[PDB]
Amino acid sequence: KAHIELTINGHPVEALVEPRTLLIHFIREQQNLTGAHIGCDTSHCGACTVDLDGMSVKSCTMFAVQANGASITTIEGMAAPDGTLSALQEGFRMMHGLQCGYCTPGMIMRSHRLLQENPSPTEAEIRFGIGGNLCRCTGYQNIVKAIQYAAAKINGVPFEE
Amino acid sequence: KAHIELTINGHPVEALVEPRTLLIHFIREQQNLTGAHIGCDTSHCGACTVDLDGMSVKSCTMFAVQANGASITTIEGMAAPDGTLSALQEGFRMMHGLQCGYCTPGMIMRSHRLLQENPSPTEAEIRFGIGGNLCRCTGYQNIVKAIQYAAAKINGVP
Amino acid sequence: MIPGSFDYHRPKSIADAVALLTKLGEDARPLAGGHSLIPIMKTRLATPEHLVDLRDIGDLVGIREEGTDVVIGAMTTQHALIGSDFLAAKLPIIRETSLLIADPQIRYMGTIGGNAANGDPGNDMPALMQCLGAAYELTGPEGARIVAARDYYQGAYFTAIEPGELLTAIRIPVPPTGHGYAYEKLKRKIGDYATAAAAVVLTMSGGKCVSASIGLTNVANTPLWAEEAGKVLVGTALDKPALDKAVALAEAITAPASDGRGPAEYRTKMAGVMLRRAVERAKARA
Amino acid sequence: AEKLQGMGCKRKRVEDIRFTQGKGNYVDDVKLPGMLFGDFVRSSHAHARIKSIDTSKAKALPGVFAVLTAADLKPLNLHYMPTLAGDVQAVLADEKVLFQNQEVAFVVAKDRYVAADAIELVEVDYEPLPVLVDPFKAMEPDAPLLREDIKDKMTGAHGARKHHNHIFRWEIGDKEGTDATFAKAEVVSKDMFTYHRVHPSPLETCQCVASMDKIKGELTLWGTFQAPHVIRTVVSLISGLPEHKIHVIAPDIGGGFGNKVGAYSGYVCAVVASIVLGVPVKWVEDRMENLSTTSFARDYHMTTELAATKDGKILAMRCHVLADHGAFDACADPSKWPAGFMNICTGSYDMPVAHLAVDGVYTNKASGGVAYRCSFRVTEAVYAIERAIETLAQRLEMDSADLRIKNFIQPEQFPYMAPLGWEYDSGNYPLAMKKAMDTVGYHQLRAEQKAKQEAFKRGETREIMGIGISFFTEIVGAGPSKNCDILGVSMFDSAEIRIHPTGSVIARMGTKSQGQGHETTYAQIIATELGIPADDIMIEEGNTDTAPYGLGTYGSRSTPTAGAATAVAARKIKAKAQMIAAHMLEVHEGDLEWDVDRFRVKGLPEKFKTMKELAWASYNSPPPNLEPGLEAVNYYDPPNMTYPFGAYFCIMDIDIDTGVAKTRRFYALDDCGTRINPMIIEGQVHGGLTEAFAVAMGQEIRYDEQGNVLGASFMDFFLPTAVETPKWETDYTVTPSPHHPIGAKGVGESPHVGGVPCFSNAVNDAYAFLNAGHIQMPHDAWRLWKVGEQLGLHV
Amino acid sequence: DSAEIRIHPTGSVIARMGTKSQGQGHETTYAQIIATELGIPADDIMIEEGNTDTAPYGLGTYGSRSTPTAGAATAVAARKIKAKAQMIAAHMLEVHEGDLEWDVDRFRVKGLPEKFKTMKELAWASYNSPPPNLEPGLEAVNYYDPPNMTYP
Amino acid sequence: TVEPTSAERAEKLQGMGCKRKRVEDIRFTQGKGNYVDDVKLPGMLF
Ligand SMILES: Cc1cc2nc3c(=O)[nH]c(=O)nc-3n(C[C@H](O)[C@H](O)[C@H](O)COP(=O)(O)OP(=O)(O)OC[C@H]3O[C@@H](n4cnc5c(N)ncnc54)[C@H](O)[C@@H]3O)c2cc1C
Ligand SMILES: Nc1ccn([C@@H]2O[C@H](COP(=O)(O)OP(=O)(O)OC[C@H]3Oc4nc5nc(N)nc(O)c5nc4C(S)=C3S)[C@@H](O)[C@H]2O)c(=O)n1
Ligand code: FES
Ligand code: FES
Ligand code: FES
Ligand code: FES
Ligand SMILES: [Cu+2]
User: Fold this and answer.
1) Residue A84: closest CA among chain D residues belongs to which residue?
2) Could you give the number of structural domains in chain E?
């Protein structure tokens, strides 16, 4: 086993992992951060998406050892300490951007980086921008609305209807 | 912290403990063997009784470090590997020797050693023999019956 | 329930234990069976910085006859005392007393040395050892020495032991074969320290008492050897007039505490009643 | 037939399987992610103002997450909590402390070891105030003002408000008629009997694990609660959290004996701490804190009087009680009964009139009063009348068994309206008293006693013999909605029973066992009603999200209330099954008759449907007019209490020179109507008689002049071991409750209620020939030595 | 399919059904049905499904059957509670049930709107002062056998 | 709004016909849903 040290949701983390342990399992099985989910075995769904060193990464396609020294944010790290939900979490609820909730953590983590890449995206940029995340429940329409809501909240001004 | 190694219910156990950690807390809190109970803070009740190196010991009155290298049996270790209850566990049930069940693990662990010290005890020997164990529910009468029942079952095994 | 933190030590020999106790100082305490020390550590009345466990010192456990004495290692448990048929043949009063101490679990751990070194007037072995005229062997940094049990206790938790010393063994003179003996204890329930208890050993010849020695438990801030009381019995037929005199002399030296077991006057009277009953059983056995 | 194990069977307990293997689930066995531990810095003073509390050193200690003081609770209006008696109790001492060991600050740390360390670091500066511990002086003009928060220095009894230390005055009965009878009766027998302060001391202390889920806004609270639903409702009312978001869970409880009915500061503090920190907080008290700060029992000073004719007819009873409630009135009781059912004190005797008055007072002691198998002060009521019967008998120079027989309420007089308001349901006292007397050879014992007394007078023995008698009438099953409620909630109870497609059952009740065998016995009731094997039935209690609302387990109310609800709910299921059978058999329901486990067509016994077939049919071929499924619920509001009774006889031998007493024989006849499980009833009696023995012969909690609580640890608190506990001889008669669905009355507390007077009457009876008068409990050795000392027996 | 609805003394609710959501929003929508039927805000109602020890027996969620079956059972169970609440109101207001009319969350006496009892008051009364002929508490169950399918 | 109108009281119910926001969203948007693979028990094998 290899010894790794990193930062997850702002807190230092130290652990022992086998090299072959996928980051998604290190996060879910060892750190008990079970918000991230597994939806496939071919790297298509994005349900395992976490924000790592400023990048949206599919944690089922990286080994925990590769993240040694990294800073990771998972869905559990999105809400504010005062309990207030982030703009994105609120937007997903207000716009009905989730149903079973399975793709939600990965969708919100991807969206968190998308709005930093482009604070005021068009509908086309939003759809392309979350192309790595599959959802079986929503048909995506309300997810696009949720992301627009969050962007307007963050920006203090709306853009597209 | 001190490194200790011992055997509990036939299994090797190794751990790091503060010397002041009482054995009862090591068993309940670190090993998650929650059968043993705490019923007092003065060493009178015996609810924390375990079998340690052939002795009945009140684990709230010993530090885990004192047990380094010991062999301990707790209530979870009384049933047979195939799940069958020991004569004492069966006797307590058949004779209604428990109600709330709080003193039971300690009562059965003490009894286990008592019947090894004296396989065929009289009632006076049984009552005196469990003098270090308090029960609030039973009035002890059925516990005496439970122990007599177990002795008869054990004496029939050979 | 929770003791303060401390460092733990496991010396392999008496020499090592003594050196450690001498070095560490007043903040270090020997740990024997732990059944008086741990309870007071849990209430934080005792907050030692170091515990020196005597567990690994084999030379502290054992029962042997040496010359006209039986020598018992300080770490010998109450359970071991009761189990010794050799001891029951020579000093039957010990098994009788031990069976009146605490309960099975505590007897599996509690040691005779710890019972004698404690300084709690509630302990039963001290006055028994005074009755028997036992001597305590102590080993400290300055060497070995002996202190009679009769001279060892000064008050609650106050004894003759010095810094760095360990009580290593108890040397007990063997009474004449056929001697009478008895330990009579009055308590509220199993495990309770005595309201009052009396230890008696005596010998008889031609219907008259030849020798008699009496110890009184928990009826003063220390155990008591009732010297005058035993003296008055010698030369008598141990009849009521003799017993009355012995009771007067024993009661006279008591100064019990008034606590849950009752007021001082009751405990003084009970020291007398336990003494009468013990003399009676001892007389029958002699 | 072998598999049914219904009513009457000595069914072995289902609880034993897990308990004998260490797999029960008690509060301290609970471990949750991020769980912290909290405990209290407690008061070293009985009465003093709190000048300052320095928690800086404690908060600075590594591993300490919080240290709460009253200053922190006020903003939530939580520095005081409501009590079942309608008063308030301090959660954390604010301006002053009123009893030794009272809660002052709550330290929350990573574990119980660090918490203990931190508690030692908190420094409290106290300003001593005069201590009040003698209730007989609590209302003198110069008595210390304890409750500054609710009272104003009222040093009298003729002001707008009682006296600053007076809690309440409660009276019942015909005062004018009672007084008039006492004014003319040939004989007046008066004594002041004190029922000393003791404590229920369950082997498991009080504790909880509070877990506020701040993400969901829901509180889960595991705890030692005898009334979990009531706790949920109270928590909701004081926290502002709605009940559907508070999940209270009373898991396995290691005995309660009344100690776990009320709420304690520890529960409130753990909940507040968890709400503040967002992580679980466990609180588990040690024994010394349990005995000195949780519900005490008894502490009644009873001036008791009987008026009678020279020939032994009882004409009236007059009783006044001075009740010591400690610093706060936290005495459990239905809200309209500040002295519980102490008005059952005319007992088993037919008296024309009576009067009872009770004054409660505050003292610098822990709160409580109702606990330890008291049935709401019935222990005190029975002690008062059974001791009074004996002292009247002595004054009349009459055998007390004959005095009782001459005054028993007769079988034909039931339902009997007693002079203090309770209507007894059923009872055959003469038959039970006769069976008891014949079993123990009563008259032979009296002859033996007489000869032993003469031998004592001749100097031939130092042992005296006493014969104790206790014939009692209990009152249990607190529930008529008309007069019984817990803080406004009527005292009914409940049962919900659901039958699965394949015939097994899940049933839940609003009560909560702490060892009484409910998980075994409620199944026996259903088994008999429906013909379904008891092992095919699962019984659950204690989870407020799932069990129907109930008022909990105390006052031996489980069988009278939830036991009745279980039978009524099962009968609703039986009625629906009969409709299903009628549909399947194509007959009118009137043409069907129930036969153990099936409905048969009258006359054509070959045509039938078993409960199992009907359960399947309710899901597979539901009759068109009926809803599918087979389940029912019943919330049972009892029409009256149940009144079990007993005849107890104790033969006691006492060494007058040491004061040591030894029970020679103890016979206990109990009649609780229909007996569901004889094995479990026997166990309840053994336990209760053991408590009675302990209370009468040695148990006590005392306070000295400085307010120091004394004897509050197992170093002194008399809990008998197997060596001291007498062997018990039990017997019974069966006099069903006419109004109960299965004729069953409660019985759990009877042994303690009747046992204490039995033991105390035996001790008092032993010394009666020496004119000792009334000897106050406990009868331990030093106190009986003092009795002999004062009678001149030692010189 | 089925529904069981239990009203607490203070007016909040725990209700369970024999269906099982896999994202269709049952925990939100079943509460809306009950809210309208009883005049209790949806946020004061907790909905649960899926634990066979606690939820009433049902056949599950598939065939878009939840609303047609358990949705119906929820309405019928709530209506049983409302009928009992009406009885409690008549008893308390001392009028005949026929003299009462429902106004969103309370029963008012016809022609005398100032005389009324809210569902919240009735829930407390069901535990605090149950009418003599009624059992204490306020809850109900319904197992609904549909007369036909629905054809959207 | 102490004694809200019938309309106001009906609106507060968030009952039938309203676009009530989902209660499930609170836990799901925070990764606090409890799906089968999130379950961990003592001694659990795969
Ligand atoms: C519930 C209960 C009931 C009891 N009832 C009784 C009773 O009825 N009668 C009775 O006699 N006892 C009673 N005891 C006390 C028991 O017998 C203790 O075992 C005994 O008092 C102390 O012996 P120990 O070996 O446990 O010593 P420890 O507790 O280890 O130590 C006692 C003290 O002696 C010191 N010490 C120990 N060994 C030595 C040594 N060799 N040299 C120098 N110092 C040493 C320790 O440093 C400490 O200060 C009871 C104890 C309990 C918990
Ligand atoms: N006619 C009857 C009456 C009772 N029983 C059985 O006896 C048991 C006790 O029933 P009941 O008399 O209704 O009393 P509760 O169950 O309501 O118990 C409460 C009572 O229980 C007592 N006994 C206790 N026993 C244990 N082990 N633990 C407690 O905490 C106890 N607390 C005390 C105190 S205090 C009280 S108030 C139940 O299994 C019942 O089915 C029976 O077989 N037939
Ligand atoms: S689990 Fe599907 S991309 Fe990672
Ligand atoms: S909400 Fe179900 S997969 Fe997206
Ligand atoms: S917990 Fe009571 S003797 Fe150990
Ligand atoms: S069974 Fe409850 S303490 Fe013994
Ligand atoms: Cu009671």
Assistant:
1) D215
2) 1
